[PDB]
Amino acid sequence: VHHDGFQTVKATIDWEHPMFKLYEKAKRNGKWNPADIDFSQDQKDFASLTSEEKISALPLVAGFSAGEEAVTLDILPMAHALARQGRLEDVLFLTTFMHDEAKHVEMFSRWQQAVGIGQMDLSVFHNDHYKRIFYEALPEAMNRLYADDSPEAVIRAATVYNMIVEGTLAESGYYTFRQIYKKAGLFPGLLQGIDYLNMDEGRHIQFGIYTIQRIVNEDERYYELFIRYMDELWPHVIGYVDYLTELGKRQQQLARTYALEIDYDLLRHYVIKQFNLRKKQISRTKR
Amino acid sequence: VHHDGFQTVKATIDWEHPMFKLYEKAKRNGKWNPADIDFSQDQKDFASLTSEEKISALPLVAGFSAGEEAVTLDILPMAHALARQGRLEDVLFLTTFMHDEAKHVEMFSRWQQAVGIGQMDLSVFHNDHYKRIFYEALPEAMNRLYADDSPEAVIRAATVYNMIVEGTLAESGYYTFRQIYKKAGLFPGLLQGIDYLNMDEGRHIQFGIYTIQRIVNEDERYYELFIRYMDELWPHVIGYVDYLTELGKRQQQLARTYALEIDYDLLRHYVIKQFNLRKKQISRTKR
């Protein structure tokens, strides 16, 4: 459908827009290139491991690799819906968001290739709860925006994508990676990547907060929708976390070898902490 | 609609894909930031000019600023359609494409702000032919892909976007900018930007060639569609070029002041040359 005019011909970019400022920060802080990461020590580490230890790391990598790919594809409808609303600064920022995720897909896929498991099908570590979030609920909520960009729809899309998938699951996965392999001195390449991902993620979550809050600011009853949508997905969040925890407990050879007292109870509490603090970053009353 | 699986969980990125290689080149060659360009001399230049000279530059900037904004918005449906086809490497590359265009919008809008014309509405220099390409034909061809991603539709989208708007009009505009203001020693900031744009553009056009050719490679009769779609838009291309040429001739004070023998006949021939050579970059027979 036709353009009726262009903001940067009639006027200029709104230089003070929060999303323009986040876009600028993304350009400054987003120069890292996965192709520069040295994975040579990672290959050696992985080879040194026993088959039982080798397995221990793959479920987490399987969750991340599909997660990065899902969000790379499923962010597009948000960019479209905000473009159609004429929110040019949000779109400029979202171009940095989409490119970040592309790099994240690249980073895990390079690690898999390097350590020799590229040919292995890691879908076996996606249980029903994970599939429910990433194979279904995420793409349903985002694709909805193509035909329905109501405030309700935009809040639900930002909630599933930015507050749950990124704000709860990704954040807890970054924490878990450090708690386990950083301790062990294992996979330095991967951990360098994880640090870069976690830095990008900060901006992704801030987009989600900004988006949900500006809708809540119009009608304080959207706050209730936000809480309700968070709570609808919790059972799948913890159900995936529980499945990963059970696998961890059934395969403890890596932990013993590397003297890691892996506290699954503390990881679980971190997830619960993440979830609850994302709720608190949205104020029911106009902020 | 649901994801049935993820390529980087079942396998890896196809590292040898031409679009993965272009993505890698985009990361290496795409670090420039419009926010780093020093526009101070540009502000002084523009102020030094008479009102008659001031005007001389604005039609070209008006065409570019709206063009950059149009393509930033209108590339999204291509990314979607290729995502839905599972072409992961094309999508990774398209994230660099979208971010480039965002920077291009930013660059012209920063120049406008800096030289003091941000508040001026430059839509007056968009004639009917320009509107036909940028306000209508471009968004029609791209948006079509949301409901119709047939090879015919994809070829028409790549033809209007990559071969005409970028491959013919943008390329000729870059040439024109140099021919005129580089000669004059004017607007060094803007010309630094133009050089960066023109470097990005090379990859954008190569995506379009790759896309059209891989469809032509399946059925050599798509070649005819490509030629026909090129020829359908030519009258608007030259009709905009003629309008810009007429404005140039009616306002020659900048040319006289700066001793520029501006050859509008040579610019026009460059446009014709661009158009004809984009045709030649598509081979009817399997390449």
Ligand SMILES: CCCCCCCCCCCCCCCC(=O)O
């Ligand atoms: C053992 C404790 C469980 C910790 C939680 C593990 C969550 C794994 C994360 C996989 C999905 C990652 C989502 C990517 C989001 C993004 O890239 O923006």
Ligand SMILES: CCCCCCCCCCCCCCCC(=O)O
């Ligand atoms: C005086 C001779 C005429 C020369 C032709 C002028 C064309 C002006 C270009 C304006 C549209 C630019 C399109 C941007 C494409 C992109 O950013 O990929």
Ligand SMILES: [Fe+3]
């Ligand atoms: Fe993210």
Ligand SMILES: [Fe+3]
């Ligand atoms: Fe371009």
Ligand SMILES: [Mn+2]
């Ligand atoms: Mn269950």
Ligand SMILES: [Mn+2]
């Ligand atoms: Mn005419």
Ligand SMILES: [Mn+3]
């Ligand atoms: Mn990510």
Ligand SMILES: [Mn+3]
């Ligand atoms: Mn451009």
